[PDB]
Amino acid sequence: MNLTELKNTPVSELITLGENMGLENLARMRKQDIIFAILKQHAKSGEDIFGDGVLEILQDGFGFLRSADSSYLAGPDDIYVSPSQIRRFNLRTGDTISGKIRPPKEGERYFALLKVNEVNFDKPENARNKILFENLTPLHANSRLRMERGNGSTEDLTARVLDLASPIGRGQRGLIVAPPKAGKTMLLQNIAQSIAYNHPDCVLMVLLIDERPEEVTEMQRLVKGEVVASTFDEPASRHVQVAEMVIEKAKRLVEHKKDVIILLDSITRLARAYNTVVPASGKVLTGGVDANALHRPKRFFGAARNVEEGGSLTIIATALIDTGSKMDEVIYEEFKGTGNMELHLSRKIAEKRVFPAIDYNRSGTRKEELLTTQEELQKMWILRKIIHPMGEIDAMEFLINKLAMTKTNDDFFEMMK
Amino acid sequence: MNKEILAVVEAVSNEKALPREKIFEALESALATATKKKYEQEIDVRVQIDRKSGDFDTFRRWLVVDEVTQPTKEITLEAARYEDESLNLGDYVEDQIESVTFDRITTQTAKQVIVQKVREAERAMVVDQFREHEGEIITGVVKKVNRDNISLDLGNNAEAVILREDMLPRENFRPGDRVRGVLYSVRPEARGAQLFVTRSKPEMLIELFRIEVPEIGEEVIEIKAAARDPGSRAKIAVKTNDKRIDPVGACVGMRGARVQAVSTELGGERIDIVLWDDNPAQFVINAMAPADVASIVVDEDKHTMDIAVEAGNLAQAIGRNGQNVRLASQ
RNA sequence: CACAUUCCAACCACACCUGGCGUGUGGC
């Protein structure tokens, strides 16, 4: 029996199945131990059990295989793995494992793994002959990501603006600078829809840290991807745990020659969690910030790169400004000269209800010559020269108003002449 | 000592839940309790300890009234014309100064008063903040599902309560799941958790439709009635004031898709979108459908309706405990 | 495939600091 099958089931179907099995009232307790108990029963009377998830190594040597629907949380759903696997197949933190499991025997409460069927959607034999992550040779953005769908709906134009404001490719680092109440949420939503529609081949992951549960719920069932998130009713331990697990999963997946693109919103809340979870090293900055509290966020942001040997990792993290604290400014200043794809969203345009509010003049992309052709980049330069002397609001006014009538971006370039 | 008072008022844990003037009044009440514990008699004292910078300068209340009981706080109206009191209540004068606001018992009672005051603060703050979401559905994991009620974490030190009477034997609970509802009553003058959320009220489902059904909310349709026997039957009666929409055809979705979704959200309760009419006769005819009724009678002096059913559809007329009728009478 | 060292409902497990003493050398 597969675990992900009972995973994609709602709680009501689990309740109905447990009542069909004729047991103690299972609807009373957690979905976690609901699945645990129904699995224990169906495995008392049932086949080999099958399961899948992502592995995290403990300091005891053993490992835990956890689910992304539980956002990689500790509980009875986890699969225990022995260090003997981590010696035989030499398992690693963040490996996508899928294999056979069994009930725990006398005194045990965690399902034990039997035989690894797929390691990162790949062969264990081929799991040995792999390349290390930092041992790779990074490179600039080589292949551009097509965000324009070509239909021109009410929201698709938003993505089109990006296609002429800051082109993104596999291996690029994107950083969004926006104050609160600027419309970045559905900005990432439309971006994710477009990159999932245009490229169903690259595995797409999003990250929500200290976000409201409403957006988490509406996102985890609207776009494609293992939509993993971290709500604010948990301490910084869980947030940094999601950070570790998904960043290691992306690292292993690009090591397996796959293009991974990670959507984070926001990087400032994650860095604040990093600060409040890391022990104090004596050196305080302005606003209660540790110098070592930015080391791991810098690692998380710089993990993205464009591999020469194969695969790529592109990160798009959003940053908050203009919200008053000391940490927001110190973090945004520390991260300004890090990413090579700035996207500035000025609230001065969002206050006029002109969406998307994009600061085209203060935005840009370095090494953008390796993403578009000569005439495409030339048209981009000419339009930037045309719109730069204009202000902010009127700039986006002209951009959106002229992209409203024409429907393909190259046609917009043509008509702009 | 004033420096320590300023350090305390500046280094409070919750600067947002415990405002500055609230710290001032809390320190004043603590020093009042301290001065009360100081003297053997019972004399109430106000402090007004130099809110911004300076130290304390206590006072002495006297409660102008012709009585004499507890003369420490007694001043007769006739023997009050000196000092230019000239009033009948509010003789809070400065007869008493030189208080000690730091010693052992005073510090302990001040810590206790501060704990009580920050608790009251947190309570009032969370209540009057999350009370704005009274008509709309609230979310949040549960703190603890006790016997007489259950308490739910709504967020940052945010708590709500759902009573036991509004629960169901089949509705099922343990710390860690999130159960929603409608905040139906708020008693900010209570002694503890005072954010009362229910789930058996009818308008709940109405509010639920306002999240899912796009026809409701723009007034183009009108959700009028909702008969809810929780766990038994949850029927809804809507009306359309326009002339281009159907009451039951649009709100049902696509062959039991949205109504089934909100039913599973409500706990898989049987939901049937009924169509009420302008008269109670057709209303109770539709509420007990699909079935026939041999007699529909209305009585005003008895405040009742006689519904006599024919034989041939009993399996859809009564059901469990007269549920198909129990909603109508409800 | 294989060793397997598990995130640990009442509650057994989380109990205590201190004195006078000692080393070495010398004496018959």
Q: Count every beta strand of chain B, where a strand is a DSSP E run of 2 or more residues.
A: 10
**Count of DSSP H/I helices of chain A:** 16
Strand content of chain B: 15-25%
Question: Separation of termini of chain A?
Answer: 62 Å
Cα-based radius of gyration of chain A, to the nearest Å: 23 Å
Oligomer state equals part of a larger assembly
Could you give the order of strands across the largest sheet of chain B? 1-2-3-5-4
Report the order of strands and helices of chain B: HHHEEEEEHEEHEHEEHH
Give the second-level CATH assignment, the architecture of the largest domain in chain A: 3-Layer(aba) Sandwich
Helix content of chain A: 25-40%
The helix count of chain B comes to 8
By secondary-structure content and strand pairing, the structural class of chain A works out as: alpha/beta
Over all CA atoms, what is the radius of gyration of chain B? 31 Å
Major sheet summary line of chain A: 9 strands, mixed
Keywords (chain A): ATP-binding, Helicase, Hydrolase, Nucleotide-binding, RNA-binding, Transcription, Transcription regulation, Transcription termination
EC number (chain A): 3.6.4.-
Family (chain A): Belongs to the Rho family.
GO cellular component, one term (chain A): membrane
